[PDB]
């Protein structure tokens, strides 16, 4: 039913190498050249990628910031409330960002907070302003 293993005798390939007297060495060098093309291409991106690597030297260690470890509280100080209204104004609804900004209240409180202080801080009016941008 099928050829010996490793032998790759397609029904369609034989005709292509049998089509003409020099057809065999045609297809065989049509690929000899195509291989070179990829090799050429590999060097290029290997250079381009190598150049980009150099630019990233230093990584971002110098631009890194120490992490704050502050115990989440549950009381809203007048300050924290104010941080909040601004965070909504600049984030809109990204719960994590707003919790990250206050860095003491959490996403549940933050999420709760909109409905608690709702008419009081005009959050709906604020949120429309965020969506404008």
């Amino acid at each position: 039913r099928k050829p010996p293993k490793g032998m790759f005798l397609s029904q369609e390939d034989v005709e292509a190498v049998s089509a003409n007297a020099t057809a065999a060495t045609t297809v065989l060098r049509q690929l000899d050249m195509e291989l070179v093309s990829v090799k050429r291409q590999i060097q290029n991106i290997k250079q381009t990628n190598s150049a980009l690597k150099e630019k990233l030297d230093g990584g971002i260690e110098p631009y890194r910031l120490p992490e704050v470890i502050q115990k989440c509280n549950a009381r809203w100080t007048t300050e924290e409330q104010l941080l909040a209204v601004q965070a909504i104004r600049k984030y809109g609804r990204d719960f994590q960002a707003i919790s990250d900004v206050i860095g003491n209240k959490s996403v549940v409180q933050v999420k709760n907070f909109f409905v608690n202080y709702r008419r009081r801080f005009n959050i709906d009016e604020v949120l429309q302003e965020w969506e404008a941008e």
């Binding site: 039913r1 099928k2 050829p3 010996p4 490793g6 032998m7 790759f8 005798l9 397609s10 029904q11 390939d13 034989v14 190498v17 049998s18 065999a24 297809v27 065989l28 690929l31 000899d32 195509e34 291989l35 990829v38 090799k39 291409q41 590999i42 991106i45 290997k46 381009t48 990628n49 980009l52 690597k53 630019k55 990233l56 990584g59 971002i60 110098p62 631009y63 890194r64 910031l65 992490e67 300050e79 104010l82 941080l83 601004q86 965070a87 600049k90 960002a97 990250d100 900004v101 206050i102 860095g103």
Partner: protein
């Protein structure tokens, strides 16, 4: 083993009747399965009897005595079976002391052309049957293509050497009948390149398996893809080996392409991700600046100023989270690219060194078929491979010449008698022969039938070495051009000191180039005497016949010198170099299934010729011209046993037409 062993040893199914036997015994085959089994046993038995002692005639009575009941109840059937076996050379063939001596008065006159093994086999059989046999020989010796060189103790077959296995081989019988020094072949063959350095086991084994894998490939092309005709021409075997090597070479390239195309596909996933990392670092760089500027405003600050420091801090650690995720990913791609660079696929399908060694495997094929692989039929070249005898091929130590010479004991053999014209008519035949030494002395022979064992190369000769009157019908002449008669030659190197490995019978030499793959590519140590024997196969064969013995012998020493060191190669004492295509009594070595030919052409060769009626309106006559020889036996061509079987075959068919076949009632 048993009775059944004798059927196998006679090339016969032990449990079914052959088409042969259906012809002689149609009552049995069309009859009840019980009688068939009786018959079959009677046959199988009788075969046994002959085989266990093949040095004495097996008379019908002898058979009946040893046969037992209930099988020995129907004497006619036993007599019917034994005659059939005897007629067609399955028993009482070869060289045997006969119990009942030859009838003093013979019936019929048969001229046999050629004292080759087919010829003598028929001759012995016909004489055996009470016919008047005479063989016409062009040569001054019998055996034809069984030639043996002899000088002092030096002995080396220029002709056949090998008995291919005794499982079912009539030569098995003959060897018991004539003492034949039958020595086995140790298959181990070490290959030596042009430098004279042996090829290492790694390499030898890896190229041999490719070679077989390559054949297995051509078979697949022929049968499953039906790649048999190309450009309105039959596909040769060699053609299809090119097309298979090319396709395996293409695949090598294909897989290199696909593999590097999988590096570019990843280097470009890296380059695109590097871009994002470089654009994010700049964004981070300027964020930091903004945060520090925002952090510079010392407290106490109003909340919009506090929000800004917190907002910038949150954002910047967010981007520092992206750039960390995007450099874990860069690590994965960097290692993934590293794997791909280390697992590159095979650089080449085969190296120049590798493919030079591959050639030596094609030279072997060329030497087996005595022809360039471009002439072999793809579809049919191995058609005779089912009927291989079992057992390991042997060589004849005292020369193969002894068989032929032993078959000529008691035969009317005119040597130095070159047949030039065969004339065959409704009423009989006459063959015209000259004396080879003085071509003018002319001979006329009359006979009831001619058996022609002229080699196929002789028959192919234009202009004709032998003319037939009337000419052979085209159906015969066409099968003659269609068929292939090829070439291989031998060089016999005779030396006083054995300076090679005496425990290896054969060892190769890898030719420098493909076009010279068969020039002395194989050497044989077969003999008690110190003789190495060099083969010239493929294209080399036809070419080396235009070159001197000395020049040919030189290239022999050279190669031997290279594999053993200039020091240990003494000048050969006696040199003989065959030139079979040149020989006009052979004009070749043996037949091969040419491209465009088939196994049916051998069948064609063996159908005999019936001439036209002398007086128009007379009844359709008897056939008068019969053909034997290795080119007539489709299942066992180009072999001494095939020749022999064809002589046995025609003898029985000639006996049946002129002595009548009484075993059919």
């Amino acid at each position: 083993s048993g009775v059944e062993g004798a059927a196998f040893q006679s090339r016969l199914p032990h449990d079914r009747m052959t088409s042969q036997e259906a012809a002689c015994f149609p009552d049995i085959i069309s009859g009840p399965q019980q009688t068939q089994k009786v018959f079959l046993f009677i046959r199988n038995r009788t075969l046994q009897l002959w085989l266990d002692n093949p040095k004495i005639q097996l008379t019908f009575e002898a058979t009946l005595q040893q046969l037992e009941a209930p099988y020995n109840s129907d004497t006619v059937l036993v007599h019917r079976v034994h005659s059939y076996l005897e007629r067609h050379g399955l028993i009482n063939f070869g060289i045997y002391k006969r119990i009942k001596p030859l009838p003093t008065k013979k019936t019929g006159k048969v001229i046999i052309i050629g004292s080759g093994v087919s010829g003598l086999a028929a001759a012995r059989q016909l004489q055996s049957f009470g016919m008047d046999v005479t063989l016409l020989e062009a040569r001054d010796r019998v055996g034809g293509r069984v030639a043996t060189f002899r000088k002092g103790n030096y002995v080396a077959d220029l002709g056949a050497m090998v008995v291919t296995g005794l499982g079912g081989n009539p030569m098995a019988v003959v060897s018991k009948q004539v003492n034949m020094e039958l020595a086995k072949i140790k298959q181990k063959c070490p290959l030596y390149e042009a430098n004279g350095q042996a090829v290492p086991k790694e390499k030898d084994e890896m190229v041999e398996q490719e070679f077989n894998r390559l054949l297995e490939a051509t078979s697949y092309l022929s049968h499953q893809l039906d790649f048999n005709v190309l450009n309105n021409k039959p596909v040769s075997l060699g053609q299809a080996l090119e097309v298979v090597i090319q396709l395996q070479e293409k695949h090598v390239k294909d897989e290199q392409i696909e593999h590097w195309k999988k590096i570019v596909k990843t280097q470009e996933e890296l380059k695109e991700l590097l871009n994002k990392m470089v654009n994010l670092k700049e964004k981070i760089k300027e964020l930091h600046q903004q945060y520090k500027e925002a952090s510079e405003v010392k407290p106490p600050r109003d909340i919009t100023a506090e929000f800004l420091v917190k907002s910038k801090h949150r954002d910047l650690t967010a981007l520092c989270k992206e750039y960390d995720e995007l450099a874990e990913t860069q690590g994965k791609l960097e290692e993934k690219l590293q794997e791909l660079e280390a697992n590159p696929p095979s650089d080449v399908y085969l190296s120049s060194r590798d493919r030079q060694i591959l050639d030596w495997h094609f030279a072997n094929l060329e030497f087996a078929n005595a022809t360039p692989l471009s002439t072999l039929s793809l579809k049919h070249w191995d058609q005779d491979d089912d009927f291989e005898f079992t057992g390991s091929h042997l060589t004849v130590r005292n020369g193969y010449s002894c068989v032929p010479v032993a078959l000529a004991e008691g035969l009317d053999i005119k040597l130095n008698t070159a047949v030039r014209q065969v004339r065959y008519t409704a009423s009989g035949c006459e063959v015209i022969a000259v004396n080879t030494r003085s071509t003018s002395q002319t001979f006329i022979y009359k006979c009831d039938a001619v058996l022609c064992t002229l080699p196929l190369g002789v028959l192919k000769q234009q202009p004709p070495a032998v003319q037939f009157v009337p000419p052979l019908p085209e159906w015969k002449t066409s099968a003659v051009q269609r068929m292939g008669f090829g070439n291989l030659n031998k060089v016999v190197l005779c030396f006083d000191r054995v300076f090679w490995d005496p425990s290896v019978n054969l060892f190769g030499h890898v030719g420098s180039t493909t076009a010279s793959r068969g020039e002395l590519f194989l050497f044989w140590n077969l003999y008690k005497a110190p003789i190495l024997l060099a083969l010239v196969a493929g294209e080399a064969a036809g070419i080396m016949e235009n070159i001197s013995d000395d020049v040919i012998v030189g290239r022999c020493l050279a190669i031997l010198k290279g594999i053993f060191g200039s020091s240990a190669v003494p000048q050969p004492k006696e040199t003989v170099v065959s030139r079979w295509r040149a020989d006009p009594w052979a004009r070749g070595s043996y037949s091969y299934v040419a491209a465009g030919s088939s196994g049916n052409d051998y069948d064609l060769m063996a159908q005999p010729i019936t001439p036209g009626p002398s007086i128009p309106g007379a009844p359709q006559p008897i056939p008068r011209l019969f053909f034997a020889g290795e080119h007539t036996i489709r299942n066992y061509p180009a072999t001494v046993h095939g020749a022999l079987l064809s002589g046995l075959r025609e003898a029985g068919r000639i006996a049946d037409q002129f002595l009548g076949a009484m075993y059919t009632l």
